[PDB]
Write a protein that binds this ligand. Structure first.
Ligand SMILES: *[C@@H]1O[C@H](CO)[C@@H](O[C@@H]2O[C@H](CO)[C@@H](O)[C@H](O)[C@H]2NC(C)=O)[C@H](O)[C@H]1NC(C)=O
Length: 482
């Protein structure tokens, strides 16, 4: 049995089931999600290898070879048609065309389930999915349960990395008009103990970590690489239960009556489904979604325990984020442009601006150093890497407003994430392509001889698809600074 077979047996059937990694029903063999590649904007679907099995990652790799891919749709496996598509603008506009939120990269969250390769949904700030015409989802004060397997190490404090029930108008219609899982360390509303992140329940105009608005000591920080967040709500009752998705049981962080504030009892759920954003489309949060469902009815603890048992059995393990030549920590290199007509240029920097310049044996000692980089273990992820300036030790290449800058490491999580890049076999076959760890839809890309963290097509001029593949491919050579 799969998670939804378990919920069905527990008398609280799934009304929405989403996952890019595996089938959530033992009998499901349909499409798990849809992909769209940047080379020609064509699409294709990825289905389980077998009924109730793991996604066919090989099919994705084949379709996405020598180009970039986006996850356009996360299909609803229940049959209710509650598929998740690109989230629309609402109370807040997204950063994409006409206010839509960004689609997620198809390769930002590689994993293996019991040894089989699969891809999760790595969501950077601005990314979001939604379905504002869902069927079967609880409305009003109707009871529902839900869970999601997330990455407890991928999060931030901006509103709001949610998965669950929200408004069908994509706007904030008041307290009680939402009921969704939240994972992050926002403290604007509720928050738990420690540094976070915390699993909280977004009931609109409030993220709740317990009965009181604001701080609630009963909700602990949970930072497992794979987190199972289980939330449920019914008539004047709700609960938060969490666990290490890779091992053990769910622990109850909260179970009791609704927060005693106007609008939360009875609830006024609208039934829309959101992923990675807030009800009003607040889109500043980040996180990773692997699988999750929403049910009709209030799940018993026993039913959820069986679901957690199943998740553990799926055996989630982190996958490889790197491919191609790659590097070794401590190694010093110079990166050469491969785009025809700019092949004598190297990645360098003029003060804080990262750019490309013609550097050769005749260059000054200073310029040779500005075109030389010490490759160190990724500041935000040990699999990837960070690039430290040779002339300016202590400073690394980092993206800011999608421009690559050379700034001093302040030791903060944010800097670390902005400064971590994962090597990928060059899209044009020449060398390597450095993919941003925090924004996997973006890569080192030279445009007008300046370096950016650009996507294959986008709202920024430097996201131009023209010569993208060549512009994000660099040959790794001996450092000029020796
Ligand atoms: C959420 O967690 C992060 C990570 O611990 C906090 O970020 C730090 O941010 C402050 C404020 O900018 C800096 O003094 C620290 O140097 C940062 N620490 C790290 C480890 O990066 C963030 O402040 C937290 N947010 C809230 C609202 O509590």
């Amino acid at each position: 049995m799969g998670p939804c077979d378990i919920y069905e047996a527990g008398d609280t059937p799934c009304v929405a089931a989403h996952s890019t990694t595996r089938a959530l029903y033992s009998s499901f063999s349909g499409a798990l999600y849809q992909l769209q590649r940047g080379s020609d904007d064509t699409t294709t679907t990825i289905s389980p290898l077998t009924a109730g099995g793991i996604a066919d990652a090989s099919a994705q790799d084949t379709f996405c070879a020598n180009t970039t891919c986006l996850i356009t749709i996360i299909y609803d496996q229940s049959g209710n048609g509650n598929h998740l598509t690109q989230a629309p603008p609402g109370g807040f506009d997204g950063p994409d065309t006409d206010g839509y939120d960004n689609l997620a990269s198809a390769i930002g969250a590689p994993v293996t389930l019991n040894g089989q390769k699969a891809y999760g949904v790595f969501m950077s700030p601005g990314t979001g999915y939604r379905n504002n015409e869902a069927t079967g989802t609880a409305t009003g004060d109707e009871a529902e349960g839900m869970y999601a397997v997330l990455d407890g190490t991928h999060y931030n404090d901006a509103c709001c990395f949610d998965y669950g029930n929200a408004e069908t108008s994509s706007t904030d219609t008041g307290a009680g008009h939402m009921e969704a899982i939240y994972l992050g360390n926002s403290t604007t509303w509720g928050y738990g103990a420690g540094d976070g992140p915390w699993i909280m329940v977004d009931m609109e105009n409030n993220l709740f970590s317990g009965a009181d608005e604001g701080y609630n000591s009963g909700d602990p920080s949970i930072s497992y690489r794979f987190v199972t967040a289980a939330v449920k709500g019914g008539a004047d009752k709700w609960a938060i239960r969490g666990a290490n998705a890779a091992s053990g049981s769910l622990s109850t962080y909260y179970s009791g009556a609704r927060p005693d504030y106007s609008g939360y009892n009875p609830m006024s759920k609208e039934g829309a489904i959101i992923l990675g954003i807030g009800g009003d489309n607040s889109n500043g949060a980040q996180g990773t979604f692997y699988e999750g469902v929403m049910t009709s009815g209030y799940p018993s603890d026993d039913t959820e325990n069986s679901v957690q048992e199943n998740i553990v059995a799926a055996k989630y393990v982190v996958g490889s984020l790197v491919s191609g030549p790659s590097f070794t920590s401590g190694e010093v290199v110079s990166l050469r442009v491969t785009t025809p007509g700019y092949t004598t240029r190297y990645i360098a920097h003029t003060d804080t601006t990262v750019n490309t310049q013609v550097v050769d044996d005749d260059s000054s000692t200073t310029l040779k150093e500005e075109a030389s980089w010490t490759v160190v273990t990724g500041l935000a992820n040990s699999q990837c890497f960070s690039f430290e300036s040779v002339d300016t030790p202590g400073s690394y290449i980092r993206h800011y407003n999608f421009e690559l800058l050379l700034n001093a490491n302040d030791g903060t999580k944010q800097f670390h994430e902005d400064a971590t890049f994962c090597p990928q076999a060059a899209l044009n076959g020449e060398g390597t392509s450095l993919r941003s760890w925090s924004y996997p839809t973006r890569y080192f890309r030279h445009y007008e001889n300046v370096l950016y963290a650009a996507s294959n097509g986008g709202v920024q001029t430097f996201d131009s698809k023209t010569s993208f593949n060549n512009d994000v491919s660099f040959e790794i050579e001996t450092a000029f600074a020796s």
